[PDB]
């Protein structure tokens, strides 16, 4: 719930889009 | 994006709509003869995938309203080019329906932007307390944003729906998955704007002056079209199917 | 009720259409006199059915603003600059009283503070200049000082004097014959017979003066002044 389900869920690690959308300036 | 941002807003409204209809007509009248070994179908396939992906991944990193609109335009161009990649009557029909719906949504959004441009709106955070000062303009802008996202009840869902149907008709399953993921990302960064208007409570508010009659009537008509298009969509489909067939006979 | 409000709103729609037609007719003839910025102030203003009921022998100054359910007794007077606004509740003004210049007698604007108490004014009650009466209730033959700020829930008993500049806090009763003054209002001294007699005579003096002011305000509007304003070069 708070661990594997969350980390592999939508915001534990799926928030890499912040580290992916911001790179579009290249 | 730089051209769209730097251009005057009334100018940006025209370049976002008019140069696309005519150019798409030219591309169709080139496909009627230039289908040489399905060469363009591959080029438009790659261009559409890349356009959807880049628009979706670039509009989430935008804080200004006009840059976000430009990247939305790029994403919708990719969604329309999905129809080009699948050469069939039901593909060209999906393309034309998407063009029509996108043009109407873009006119709606740019009328809303021009309404707020009298108070020099530049950032998404500027339209923070719009749900309190003008609680009907916020609703209209949220409707337009949801129509961009493709929420089922609104008119923006019909175009994406029928484009995905056309893509699956030719058997391009890879296009459907990319379209679905791009739709999820687009819906996220579109409801992000709706979050700002209604859910945030900024310390400093920006008060806008009321719009004039022309833009008010245009917004009212386009908002009634967007919400109530699913009830009576037959004429658009009929005229689009008639146009698609007439490209050859 | 709700049926009356619909007819009232339809009346506004039809009156607006008629006024627009009249303006269009004026524009065809070349006239533009409707653009004149005339004052829209009404000494007696109604809010739907709530309209002020003013006795015939009561002086109301042309600059005084009376709004809503306001009742004025015979011999009373509302002087220049007064604002008597009772809309959520009623404002009852007795007979022989005198709301003096630039005075405010109004009721609360919302139910958040609780219940909106109607403002009641007795008979032969002297309200001072620039006195704010906000939802209180004064008995007859009383005196309210200049600049007083009576709040709601306040009862001023018979023959009770509120000193000038005082601010009577909420839910305060001034006993008969006692003078309450200061901020906040506190007992200061007991009224004497001479002050009672003067209070009684002041009401009659102002009642007689209001008749003269009403006579001077009921004269026909001067036409020389109207012509002079018309031609300004």
């Amino acid at each position: 719930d708070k661990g594997a389900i969350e980390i592999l869920g939508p915001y534990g690690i799926s928030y890499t889009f912040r580290r992916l959308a911001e790179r579009i300036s290249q | 994006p730089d051209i769209y941002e730097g251009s005057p807003t009334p100018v940006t409204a025209f370049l976002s709509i008019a140069p696309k209809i005519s150019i798409f007509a030219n591309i169709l009248r080139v496909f009627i003869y230039g289908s040489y070994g399905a060469t363009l179908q591959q080029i438009f396939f790659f261009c559409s995938i890349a356009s959807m992906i880049l628009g979706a991944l670039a509009a989430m990193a935008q804080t200004k309203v006009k840059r976000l609109l430009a990247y939305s335009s790029i994403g919708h161009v990719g969604y329309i080019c999905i129809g080009f990649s699948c050469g069939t009557i039901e593909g060209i029909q999906s393309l034309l329906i998407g063009i029509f719906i996108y043009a109407l949504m873009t006119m709606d959004a740019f009328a809303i932007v021009l309404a707020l441009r009298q108070t020099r709106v530049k950032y998404i955070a500027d339209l923070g307390a719009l749900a309190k000062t003008n609680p009907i303009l916020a609703i209209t802008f949220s409707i337009t944003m949801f129509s961009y996202a493709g929420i089922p009840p609104l008119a923006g869902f019909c175009s994406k729906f029928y484009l995905f149907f056309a893509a699956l008709g030719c058997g391009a399953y890879f296009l459907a998955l990319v379209g679905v993921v791009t739709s999820v990302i687009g819906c996220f960064y579109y409801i992000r704007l709706v979050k700002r208007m209604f859910f945030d409570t900024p310390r400093t508010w920006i008060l806008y002056e009321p719009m004039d009659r022309n833009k008010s009537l245009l917004l009212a008509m386009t908002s009634f079209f967007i919400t109530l298009f699913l009830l009576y969509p037959s004429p658009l489909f009929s005229v689009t199917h008639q146009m698609a067939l007439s490209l050859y006979l | 009720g709700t049926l009356g409000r619909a007819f009232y709103s339809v009346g506004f729609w039809i009156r607006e259409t008629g006024q627009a037609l009249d303006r269009l007719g004026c524009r065809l003839q070349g006239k533009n006199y409707f653009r004149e910025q005339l004052s829209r102030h009404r000494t007696l203003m109604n809010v739907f059915d709530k309209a002020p009921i003013v006795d015939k022998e009561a002086f109301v100054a042309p600059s005084a603003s009376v709004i809503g359910d306001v009742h004025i007794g015979r011999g009373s007077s509302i002087w220049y600059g007064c604002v008597l606004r009772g809309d959520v509740n009623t404002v009852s003004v007795g007979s022989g009283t005198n709301i003096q210049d630039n005075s405010l007698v109004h009721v609360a604007k919302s139910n958040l503070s609780g219940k909106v108490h109607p403002t009641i004014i007795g008979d032969n009650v002297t309200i001072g200049h620039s006195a704010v009466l906000h939802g209180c209730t004064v008995e007859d033959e009383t005196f309210i000082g200049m600049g007083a700020t009576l709040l709601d829930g306040v009862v001023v008993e018979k023959h009770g004097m509120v000193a000038a500049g005082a601010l009577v806090r909420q839910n305060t009763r001034i006993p008969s014959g006692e003078v309450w003054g200061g901020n906040p209002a506190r007992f200061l001294r007991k009224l004497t017979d001479e002050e009672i007699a003067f209070i009684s005579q002041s009401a009659t003096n102002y009642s007689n003066l209001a008749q003269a002011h009403a006579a001077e305000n009921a004269k026909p509007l001067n036409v020389i002044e109207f012509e002079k304003v018309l031609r300004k070069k």
């Binding site: - | - | 809010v47 709004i67 405010l104 604007k109 704010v132 601010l167 002044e225």
Partner: protein, 214 residues
């Protein structure tokens, strides 16, 4: 010593137009929002800005001849309130009389160069002198006076002629503060529907002119 005056024979003793509500001073024209209710007895002179949902009630004078006067969103200026602006304030901050959103100004309130932060309640007979700041989410008791340069800390109740600290506002009061402004806005909107865009008094003027020819 003079003790001598010269009456003017062209002075007007009765203006049939009455007092004009909007008084422009040169290029400064008061700006009133279409959603804002301004009573017909109100005088707006100079650069005065009234925003959406705001309301100005009977007898109020808003003279923005010296500096700017601004009334915020859903903030109300009640009966017979004089709002004035000075050239400069003692504190050194700009002296524009600025009223933010959800500010309730009680009747007989005299504001001069004061700045009122959002969600404040000003009591009746309150006097806010030059360069006085009322911090947000605070209530000023009725009949309270604060000298120039004084400040009301946020979240506190203040009152008295040399305004002093009374107590600290609870959560319920500081959250019901904007509800009072909303209720007063609703009442002002109720008053707003009693007036058509154009009055019909010009017909009376024409009848009066016809009674005297032209």
């Amino acid at each position: 010593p003079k003790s001598q005056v010269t009456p003017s024979p062209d002075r007007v003793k009765w203006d049939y137009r009455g007092q004009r509500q909007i008084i422009p001073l040169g290029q400064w024209l008061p700006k009133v929002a279409v959603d804002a209710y301004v009573a017909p007895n109100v005088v707006l002179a100079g650069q005065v800005t009234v925003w959406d949902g705001s309301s100005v009630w009977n007898g109020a004078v808003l003279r923005g001849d010296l500096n700017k006067i601004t009334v915020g969103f859903c903030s109300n200026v009640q009966e017979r309130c004089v709002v004035h602006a000075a050239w400069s304030s003692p504190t050194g901050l700009p002296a524009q009389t600025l009223i933010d959103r959800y500010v309730t100004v009680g009747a007989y309130s005299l504001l001069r160069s004061c700045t009122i932060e959002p969600e404040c309640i000003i009591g009746q007979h309150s006097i806010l002198m030059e360069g006085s700041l009322v911090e947000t989410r605070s209530i000023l008791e009725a009949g309270s006076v604060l000298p120039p340069g004084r400040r009301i800390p946020s979240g506190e109740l203040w009152g008295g002629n040399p305004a002093r600290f009374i107590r600290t506002l609870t959560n319920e009061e500081t959250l019901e503060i904007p509800k009072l402004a909303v209720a007063i806005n609703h009442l002002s909107g109720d008053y707003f529907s009693e007036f058509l865009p154009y009055s019909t008094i010009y017909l009376e003027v024409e009848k009066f002119k016809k009674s005297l020819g032209i």
